[model samples]
Target chain A: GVEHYTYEEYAKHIQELKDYAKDPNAVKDVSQKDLEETIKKMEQELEKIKTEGLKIMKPITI
Target chain B: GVEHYTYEEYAKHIQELKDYAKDPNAVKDVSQKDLEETIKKMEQELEKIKTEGLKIMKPITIE
Candidate 1:
C-alpha cells in the first residue's frame, strides 16, 4: 500500500525534485526511466496534496 | 551590527532554541547567563517577528 505523504514530506520531495532537476546528469539516481517514474509519482503526490489540502496545518489564529 | 532575520531564519532560530531547551544540562552551550541572554534575545526576536508580521509571506491566492 502506498503511504500518503505528510505536507512536510511532500515539501521535502518537491525540494528533492528541484535538486535533481538542477543537473540530472550529475545525479547517479537520475536514470531516464526512474526520472520519469519519479516525476509521474510526484505529480500524483502533488495532486493528492491539492485534493487533501485540508490535511495541511495553516498558521496560527492569533 | 544586528542583521534582521527573515522568517526562515527566525524559524530556524526557534527550532534551535527548542532543541537546546529540551536538555539544557546536556547542552554545552547552555550557560546560565548565555541561556538567559539567548532567551531574552529570542523573546525580543519573537516580538519583532510578531510586529513585523507583514514580512512573513502568507499562502498563495487563488485566481
Candidate 2:
C-alpha cells in the first residue's frame, strides 16, 4: 500500500505554508482561519511522521 | 541571502535518511559511523529550522 504522504509532499506543503505566511496576499480565496487550520494539520502530520516514519505496510502472503 | 537549506532539501535528506535506515545496503561506500553522524547533523539542523524557520537575509544598500 502507498503511504498517505511522502517526504516530498511534506516538504512541498511545509514550504508552501511558510511562503503563504510570508505573503498572505499571494493566496487568494483562502481566509486566515483556513490557512491556519491547514498549517496546523500539516504540522501535526509531520510530527507524526517524524516519530513513526512513513507508514510502510506489506501484504501477507497466504 | 539565500537560506543554507530549504524545506525541500530538508525533506529530501530526511527521506533519504529513513530510506537508508531501512536498508543500509542501499548506500554503498558509506560506513555506519558516517551514516549516523550525517543523520545526526541533519536532525539537529532540522530542529533549528523548525524553531527559527528558514534563514532569509537581505543586504543593506547605502546611497
Candidate 3:
C-alpha cells in the first residue's frame, strides 16, 4: 500500500525519495525496472498533490 | 508595521497567515473584507516570486 496520500505526506515522501535518488548506491540497489516504475509512480503522486492541493484552496481574485 | 518585508519574510508571513486562517477564532477576528485584501496581496507577492524566480533560473531545452 502507498505510505501517504495527503499532500503534506506526499511532499515529504517525495523529498525523501529525492534524497535517496541522489545516492548512487541507493539508486543502484533498485533494479532498472523498479527504478523506472518508481519514477513513474512518483510523477503521478506529485501531479495529484499539485492538482488536489490547488483545488482545496479558494481561487484568488485580483 | 509589517514584521516581514522581503521575499523570505513575506513567505514566512504568508505561512503564518495561512496557519492563522486555519484557526476559526482567528478567521472570525479578521473581517471578510480584510481577509480578501490580505489574500489579494498574498497572490501578488506569490506571483512576483514566481515571475522573478523563474527569470533567475535559466530554462533547459531538450534537443
Candidate 4:
C-alpha cells in the first residue's frame, strides 16, 4: 500500500532538483567527495520520487 | 587531465531531473525504462563532472 505524498511534496521534490542546479560551490569548492555525495543524493531522491509516484497511482489498499 | 563542464551545462543537467519529476507521466505513464534511463544519465553526467573537476585540479604535463 503506497501512502500518498501530497502534491506539495511532489512539487517540493521537483523543486529540490532545480535548486541543486542553482548552487554556487562548484567553481570554487568542487571536491571529489562533494561531487560524489551530490550525485548519490540525486540518485536516491530521484528513485524515491519514481517509486513515490505509486502513492498517487495505486493509493492505499490497506 | 579532466575537462570542465561550463556552469550552464551543469545547471541544465540538474534542471532535467527537475522537469522529469514535474511531468505527469508518472501518474499516467511512468515506466522502469524511463526511471532507469534518467538515473543512468545522471550518473554519467555526475561522474563526468567529478572527472572534470580533476582537470582543474591537475593540469596536463604531457612530456
Candidate 5:
C-alpha cells in the first residue's frame, strides 16, 4: 500500500501540475514522466476524495 | 488587528475563487463584489505567510 505523500509534497506536486498545465512545454523528460505519474496517482486520490465528498457533504472541518 | 481566517475558510474560499475565475459571471452580482474583497484579503494573508516563511524556514513540527 502506498502511504500518502506529505502535504508539502502534495501541495508542490499539485502546484507543478498547475504550472505545467499553463504551458505544455514547461516540464521535460523523467521529470515529466514522474510528473505524469504523480498527476495520475493524484487523480485517483482526487476521485477518492470526491466519492468521500459525495457521501459527506461538508468540507472537512479544519 | 486583522485575525486570520481558518484554513478551511481559506481553502474553500480559494476554491470558490478558482471556480469563479474560470467564469466570473459564475460568481454573480454583490456576491462577486464580496468574493473580490475576500480574494483581496486572502491574498494579503497569503503574502503574510511568505513573510513568515522568509523568517522561519521550518514547518511547525507537530507535537
Candidate 6:
C-alpha cells in the first residue's frame, strides 16, 4: 500500500508525532537514554520523510 | 514552464494535487472519479518510495 501520499496527511502525522514528543506526559516513562534514543529514531524518520520527499521531486526539471 | 517549485517539489506536489482537487475550475472535463483516481495513483507512487527508503534504512538501524 502507498504511504502518506497526501501532503496534509503527511504533515499532520509528523506534526502529531512532534506534538507527542513535546508533551511532558508522553515520554514520562522513558529514561534519559531511551529519550535520546527515541529522539534519534525520530530524527531518522524525519530525515527519511524529507529526503524521500525530495527524491520524488528530483525529476521535475520543468 | 515551472513544474514543481523546490519545497513544493515532493511534498509540495501533494499539496498542489490537493489544491487542484479543491478548485472547481481545475477539474475541467475530468470527472470527480477521474480526479480521485489520479490522486490515488500519485499516492501510490509516493508510498512506493517511502516504503523503499524505510526498507533500506531498516537493516542499517537494526539493533
Model 3 C-alpha lDDT per residue in residues B1-63, reported as the tens digit of each score? 101144565566567666665565552334656665765777686668656642111111111
After best superposition, candidate 1 residue A55: deviation in angstroms? 9.8
Per-chain TM-score (chain B), model 4: 0.36
Give the Cα lDDT of each candidate: 0.50, 0.52, 0.48, 0.45, 0.44, 0.45
* C-alpha positional error of residue A60 in candidate 5 after TM-score superposition, expressed in Å: 12
For model 1 the local lDDT of residue A22 reads 58
Judged by DockQ cut-offs, the docking class of candidate 3 is incorrect
Model 5, residue B63: displacement in angstroms?
24
lDDT by residue for model 4 over B1-63, one digit each (tens)?
122445455556446655555565434234556655654665666566566642211111111
- Among these predictions, the greatest lDDT belongs to 2
User: Deviation in angstroms for A42 in model 3?
Assistant: 1.5
DockQ of model 1 vs. true complex: 0.03
Q: Which candidate, 3 or 6, would have the higher TM-score against the true structure? A: 6
Q: What is the interface RMSD of each candidate, in Å?
A: 18.4, 17.8, 18.4, 16.6, 18.5, 15.6
For model 6, give the TM-score of chain B: 0.55
Interface RMSD of 6: 15.6
**Model 5 residue B9 lDDT?**
52
Candidate 4 lands at a TM-score of 0.24
Off by over 4 Å in 6: A1-62, B1-8, B27-29, B53-63
Q: Write the per-residue lDDT of candidate 3 for residues A1-62, one digit (tens) a residue.
A: 00124567555655665566555465243543544456556566468677774211211221
Runs of candidate 5 with Cα error greater than 4 angstroms are: A1-62, B1-30, B53-63
**Would you estimate the TM-scores of all the predictions?**
0.29, 0.34, 0.30, 0.24, 0.27, 0.33
In candidate 6, position B10 carries an lDDT of 43
- TM-score rank, highest first? 2, 6, 3, 1, 5, 4
lDDT of 1 by residue, B1-63 (tens): 112356676677566655655553533323556555655766676677767653332222111
User: Candidate 2 on A4-46: residue-level lDDT in tens?
Assistant: 3566666565676667666756635445665566566556657
